[PDB]
Amino acid sequence: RPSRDGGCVMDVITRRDQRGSGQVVTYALNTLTNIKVQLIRMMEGEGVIEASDAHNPRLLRVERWLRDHGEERLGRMLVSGDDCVVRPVDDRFSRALYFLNDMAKTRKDIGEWEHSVGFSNWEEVPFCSHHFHELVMKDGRALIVPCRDQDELVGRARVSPCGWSVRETACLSKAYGQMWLLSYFHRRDLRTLGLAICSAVPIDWVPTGRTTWSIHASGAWMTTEDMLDVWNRVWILDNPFMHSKEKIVEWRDVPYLPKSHDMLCSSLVGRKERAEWAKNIWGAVEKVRKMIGQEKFKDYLSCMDR
Amino acid sequence: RPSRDGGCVMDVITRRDQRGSGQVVTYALNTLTNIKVQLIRMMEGEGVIEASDAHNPRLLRVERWLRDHGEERLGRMLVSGDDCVVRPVDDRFSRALYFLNDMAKTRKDIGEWEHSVGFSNWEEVPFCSHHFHELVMKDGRALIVPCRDQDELVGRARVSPGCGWSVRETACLSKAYGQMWLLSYFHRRDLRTLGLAICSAVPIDWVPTGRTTWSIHASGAWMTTEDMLDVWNRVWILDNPFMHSKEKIVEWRDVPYLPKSHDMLCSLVRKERAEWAKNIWGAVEKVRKMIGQEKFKDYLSCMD
Numbered sequence: 001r002p003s004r005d006g007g008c009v010m011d012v013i014t015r016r017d018q019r020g021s022g023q024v025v026t027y028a029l030n031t032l033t034n035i036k037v038q039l040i041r042m043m044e045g046e047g048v049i050e051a052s053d054a055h056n057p058r059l060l061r062v063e064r065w066l067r068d069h070g071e072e073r074l075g076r077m078l079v080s081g082d083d084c085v086v087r088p089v090d091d092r093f094s095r096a097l098y099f100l101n102d103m104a105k106t107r108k109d110i111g112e113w114e115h116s117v118g119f120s121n122w123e124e125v126p127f128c129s130h131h132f133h134e135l136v137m138k139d140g141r142a143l144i145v146p147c148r149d150q151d152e153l154v155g156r157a158r159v160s161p162c163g164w165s166v167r168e169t170a171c172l173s174k175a176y177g178q179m180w181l182l183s184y185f186h187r188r189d190l191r192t193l194g195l196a197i198c199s200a201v202p203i204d205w206v207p208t209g210r211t212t213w214s215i216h217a218s219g220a221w222m223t224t225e226d227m228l229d230v231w232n233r234v235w236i237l238d239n240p241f242m243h244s245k246e247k248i249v250e251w252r253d254v255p256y257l258p259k260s261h262d263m264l265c266s267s268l269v270g271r272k273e274r275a276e277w278a279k280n281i282w283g284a285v286e287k288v289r290k291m292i293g294q295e296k297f298k299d300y301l302s303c304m305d306r
Numbered sequence: 307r308p309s310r311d312g313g314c315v316m317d318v319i320t321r322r323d324q325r326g327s328g329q330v331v332t333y334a335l336n337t338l339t340n341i342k343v344q345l346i347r348m349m350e351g352e353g354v355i356e357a358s359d360a361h362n363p364r365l366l367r368v369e370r371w372l373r374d375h376g377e378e379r380l381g382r383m384l385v386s387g388d389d390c391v392v393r394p395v396d397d398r399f400s401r402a403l404y405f406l407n408d409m410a411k412t413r414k415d416i417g418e419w420e421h422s423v424g425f426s427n428w429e430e431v432p433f434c435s436h437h438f439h440e441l442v443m444k445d446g447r448a449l450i451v452p453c454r455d456q457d458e459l460v461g462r463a464r465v466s467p468g469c470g471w472s473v474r475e476t477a478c479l480s481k482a483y484g485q486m487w488l489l490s491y492f493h494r495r496d497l498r499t500l501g502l503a504i505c506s507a508v509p510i511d512w513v514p515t516g517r518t519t520w521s522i523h524a525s526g527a528w529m530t531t532e533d534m535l536d537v538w539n540r541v542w543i544l545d546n547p548f549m550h551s552k553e554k555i556v557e558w559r560d561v562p563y564l565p566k567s568h569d570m571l572c573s574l575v576r577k578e579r580a581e582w583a584k585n586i587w588g589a590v591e592k593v594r595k596m597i598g599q600e601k602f603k604d605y606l607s608c609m610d
């Protein structure tokens with residue numbers, strides 16, 4: 001806290017409730033606790049409990065439901081810390097707000113007693129800051145890829161952690177670029193931009209730095225291995241949903257979202273801006289190389305049949 | 307020698323002179339004594355010896371010449387085995403054919419007493435199956451690159467030691483050829499293309515094998531699975547004693563080309579070397595399909 005004399009004081013405060021966000025087991029506990037919250041909301045909406053039970057609860061009623069349906073309701077939801085995706089037995093769940101509000105888990109950006117709005121297309125359900133789309137490759141195999149706002153992902157990469165030398169900041173960028181190639185290869189702008197970053201940063205500069213805070217980060221991109229090679233590793237070889245394990249040989253064979261989706265998730269695809277950026281992008285790459293010096297560079301941008 | 311019975315007999319024969327080509331020291335002996343032939347032939351053209359000396363040798367005249375001139379004349383010539391380049395002190399050397407002929411060293415493709423034909427232009431002189439041209443790079447540094455007829459260069463690559471030979475082994479051999487062309491004939495447009503294409507069609511793990519040339523001047527440096535640019539910078543810049551500035555070159559796009567006309571005037575850059583070069587990716591893809599499920603990279607595309 002700022003002191004009234006030009007310097008800084010540190011207060012010492014206490015309290016009982018709330019979760020410290022940097023406890024060793026915040027993720028686990030928040031998951032378990034939020035599972036419980038959703039499991040209760042399920043009960044209210046099915047009819048197992050009602051506002052009466054806030055006063056004198058019908059405990060045998062909830063314990064039967066768990067004995068008889070708990071295991072099944074558990075598999076109806078994805079819960080990661082404080083985020084969920086819930087697929088209830090029917091949409092009474094929308095109106096089921098009593099025990100949710102009573103437990104204090106007040107929903108974001110909606111009236112306290114306003115019905116919850118749902119989705120019938122899973123490709124529109126948000127989870128862990130992403131949406132997920134299904135792509136079919138040139139060989140007929142399906143991918144389901146995580147998508148995100150292009151401007152949100154570039155913008156975090158433009159933020160520097162000062163005192164970071166030209167090498168340390170180049171390495172941080174390779175981290176972002178490598179990651180974009182694992183997870184957002186299906187975004188034209190980002191494949192281009194990540195391929196350019198890898199063509200502008202030395203081959204043997206190992207990447208460093210935090211690219212995401214999600215606990216679903218592989219970090220599999222903080223290697224200096226070939227990025228296609230790691231792609232096949234995660235999307236095909238180690239992917240438990242890929243029955244056929246035939247590796248893909250060139251980036252020209254890794255799919256893209258449909259162009260409509262690209263633009264709609266805030267792609268520059270279309271404008272004279274993106275068009276002229278894509279043209280003159282090697283000039284940018286050469287500047288970064290000259291900035292960095294006599295090191296070993298390789299050319300990954302051109303392997304876009306360009 | 308074939309026998310008259312449907313088989314083959316093996317003759318044991320002897321003789322005194324000539325050189326066994328396989329002897330451990332053919333190169334050094336054929337080199338040393340061809341130095342001597344040419345040192346002699348210099349002497350005749352210079353007036354040190356005449357035909358008269360075949361009978362009455364004026365030894366002190368030749369001993370004087372070696373003493374007063376040997377070390378200088380030694381540097382006037384390049385001698386590899388039976389091949390030479392002589393820069394004599396003047397053009398009398400072209401008629402100096404006695405002794406050259408008396409020593410039995412007959413000249414190929416010329417009348418026994420017909421004057422030799424010389425070259426004013428060092429870039430037009432043949433040595434070790436090559437001409438040598440001077441190239442300036444974009445950064446102003448100069449190279450002197452070896453050159454050889456493309457068709458002879460490719461034709462030797464396009465032939466194989468034999469059947470009973472795998473697809474993997476025949477691939478590996480092709481890598482060795484293509485990677486060598488990248489070291490030494492990168493300045494040829496077609497060879498640069500065909501060399502990169504080969505490198506794009508053959509697995510990155512496959513080490514090259516076989517002999518791409520017999521020359522006693524082949525670095526051998528190409529039978530690696532190192533980056534070819536990485537070796538190119540080594541041999542043409544880092545380890546090149548003739549290279550004062552050692553800034554490394556970053557991309558094939560920066561390695562120069564013969565002047566366009568020398569390229570076409572040295573055997574395809576023609577209507578058909580447009581169809582070929584345009585659709586060469588189809589070729590690479592076919593080859594990768596034959597080879598199957600290995601790790602290929604794309605080196606042709608770093609050519610634009």
Ligand SMILES: [Zn+2]
Nearest residue numbers: 131147148265
């Ligand atoms: Zn999306």
Ligand SMILES: [Zn+2]
Nearest residue numbers: 437453454572
């Ligand atoms: Zn030439």
